[PDB]
């Protein structure tokens, strides 16, 4: 087994094709199915897995009760071969409410967040051994991007954020070999959605302050250097935002547009144009969205959007969303995962907060329309 | 230029209901959650519940669960908080408050404690 | 229900500092805010965060957050920080005063 080095071209991408759903939620009305969110997909070069983090319970179960909480000692992060539901036969990986995961190419590697909110601890845990941790900075809830990490010649990047101090840690077989603090214009970093551009690493994240377009944070393995802007694309991808005909951009600076929220997503750059994700509805988590929007990278008055797809009708309910890379015979393909959230606060016919999850992979090929929700029917479950 | 302006004084008979009012400015106005805080005179504070003007989704201490409502205008910017089934000890002086937390109650993914800010 | 409780007087004199505690079960593990309402006034945040100060506080206030104690700290008063001062933590999302403390610069 040798390192991944993700050095092939991007695959060409006229959009993206069904590849996998769970049903968790349908199924936890007759079964017992593990309550969690943060969901991600990575992949080892041979098969690939769904993870998310658990709350200590199944649905079924008293301790399903006020699941909305964020943060318990309970919370691990899960592990499943990608299509098997969380049963009860599902593996713990770690001690997590907070968490990411990548293969490069030899073993797995687990960063895991728990412990008291102003004094966190990160876990590093390779091929199942734990081999380095490291206290929280700021001591101020240390988190990270609940999505996968990316891997390059043996070392991982895993962007992780504490308090409002954004940080780049760079891994080799669990041990922190070096740390970067966030350089850039980007002004507020979270729950970056990280993808491999050799030779470097790409990532868009989250500005849960000042932006409703998404930051850049680019990464260079070898001199461990950060640079960070914003996504130019006049069609912003947070959640809140304005309609697109109000909405405005700027590749280094955020919008101003509906801070104080956000939601994860992300965004990949094709030449000059960009493919992105984003909920249907401008102001709440409901339906999915992806298309191209030509000159979407670079110039920030661009609205031309192209390859529009509905991946959740906009009556139903989304939530984070991420993408991960796949190496093929000649290109690396990038897919996405989008996390179907479910219960309270949002819909009180239950007590407890849960998701499903719905996966897609961009295609060379055609494709045609349609709408994957998680589709239980809470009104009927009691 | 934050501020939050509160409607007039009112006097209520047992058994009705109360709405106050409160317009906010000086900022988004769907950007932060605000809130509701009593005194009873002479008394100490007593908090009593949140509104998430994104979303509209609140959470009330568990005294006022069933007696209070609280509703939210992004169009004036306005919140209101309507207490039903009066009684003499909800005789106080109702602070609207401007809550910088985060709190999953209202829709947020990480739970975040500032403290209320304007008042 | 979770309970914070505060002294319902201090008394210092000018230039003396002041020191206001909270006490609550492991109120080391929670963050908390102290608030200052003067008379006839509504009350003012001066410490967010166990320890941080708003933009406009002096700097004679500061706070702290150990084990089971909260700590407000007024170092040189004056008498215009005569006041009534509210603790202030949260439990499982629920906001949570104190009873309060009275300030009182000794004249």
């Known amino acids: 087994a040798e390192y991944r080095n993700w050095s092939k071209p991007q695959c060409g991408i006229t959009g993206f094709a069904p590849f996998s759903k769970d049903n968790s939620i349908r199924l936890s009305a007759g079964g017992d199915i593990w309550v969690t969110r943060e969901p991600y997909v990575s992949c080892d070069p041979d098969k690939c897995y769904q993870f998310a983090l658990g709350q200590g319970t199944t649905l079924n179960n008293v301790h399903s009760n006020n699941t909305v909480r964020d943060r318990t000692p309970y919370r691990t992060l899960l592990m499943n071969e990608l299509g098997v539901p969380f049963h009860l036969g599902t593996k713990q990986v770690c001690i997590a409410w907070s968490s990411s995961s990548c293969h490069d190419g030899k073993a797995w590697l687990h960063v895991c967040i728990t412990g008291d909110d102003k004094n966190a601890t990160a876990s590093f845990i390779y091929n199942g051994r734990l081999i380095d941790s490291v206290v929280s900075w700021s001591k101020d809830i240390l988190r990270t991007q609940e999505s996968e990490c990316v891997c390059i010649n043996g070392t991982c990047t895993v962007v992780m954020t504490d308090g409002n101090d954004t940080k780049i840690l760079f891994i080799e077989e669990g041990k922190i070999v070096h740390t970067s603090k966030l350089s850039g214009s980007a002004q507020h970093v979270e729950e970056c959605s990280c993808y491999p551009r050799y030779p470097g690493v790409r990532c868009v994240c989250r500005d849960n302050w000042k932006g409703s377009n998404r930051p850049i944070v680019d990464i260079n393995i070898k001199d461990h250097s950060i640079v960070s802007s914003y996504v130019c694309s006049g069609l912003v991808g947070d959640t809140p935002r304005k309609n697109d005909s109000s909405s405005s951009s700027h590749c280094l600076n955020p919008n101003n547009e509906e801070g104080g929220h956000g939601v994860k997503g992300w965004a990949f750059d094709d030449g000059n144009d960009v493919w992105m994700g984003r909920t249907i509805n401008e102001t709440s988590r409901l339906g999915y969205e992806t298309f191209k929007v030509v000159e979407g990278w670079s110039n920030p008055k661009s609205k031309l959007q192209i390859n529009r797809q509905v991946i959740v009708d906009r009556g139903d309910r989304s939530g984070y969303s991420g993408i991960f890379s796949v190496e093929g015979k000649s290109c690396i393909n990038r897919c996405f995962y989008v996390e179907l959230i479910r219960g309270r606060k949002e819909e009180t016919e239950v007590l407890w907060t849960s998701n499903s999850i719905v996966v897609f992979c961009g295609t060379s090929g055609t494709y045609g329309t349609g709408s994957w929700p998680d589709g239980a029917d809470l009104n009927l479950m009691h | 230029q934050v501020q939050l302006v509160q409607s007039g004084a009112e006097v209520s008979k047992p058994g009705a209901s109360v709405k106050v009012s409160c317009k906010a400015s000086?900022?988004?106005?769907?950007?932060?959650?605000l809130g509701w805080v009593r005194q009873a005179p002479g008394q100490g504070l007593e908090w009593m519940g949140i509104?998430?003007?994104?979303?509209?989704?609140?959470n009330y201490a568990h005294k006022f669960q069933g007696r209070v409502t609280m509703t939210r205008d992004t169009s004036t910017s306005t919140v209101y908080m309507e207490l039903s089934s009066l009684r003499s000890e909800d005789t106080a002086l109702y602070y609207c408050?401007?809550?910088?937390?985060?709190?999953?109650?209202?829709?947020?993914?990480?739970?975040?404690?500032?403290?209320?800010?304007?008042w | 229900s979770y309970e914070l409780i505060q002294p319902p007087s201090v008394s210092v004199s000018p230039g003396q500092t002041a020191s206001i505690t909270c006490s609550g079960d492991?109120?080391?593990?929670?963050?908390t805010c102290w608030y200052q309402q003067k008379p006839g006034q509504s009350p003012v945040l001066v410490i967010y965060?166990?320890?941080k100060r708003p933009s406009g506080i002096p700097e004679r206030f500061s706070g702290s957050n150990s084990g089971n104690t909260a700590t407000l700290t007024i170092s040189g008063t004056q008498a215009m920080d005569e006041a009534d001062y509210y603790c202030?933590?949260?439990?499982?999302?629920?906001?949570?005063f104190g009873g309060g403390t009275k300030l009182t610069v000794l004249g």
């Open positions: 408050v401007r809550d910088l937390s985060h709190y999953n109650e209202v829709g947020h993914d990480r739970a975040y404690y500032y403290g209320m800010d304007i």
């Open positions: 000086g900022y988004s106005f769907t950007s932060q959650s």
């Open positions: 509104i998430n003007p994104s979303g509209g989704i609140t």
């Open positions: 492991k109120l080391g593990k929670k963050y």
């Open positions: 965060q166990d320890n």
């Open positions: 202030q933590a949260w439990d499982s999302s629920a906001v949570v």
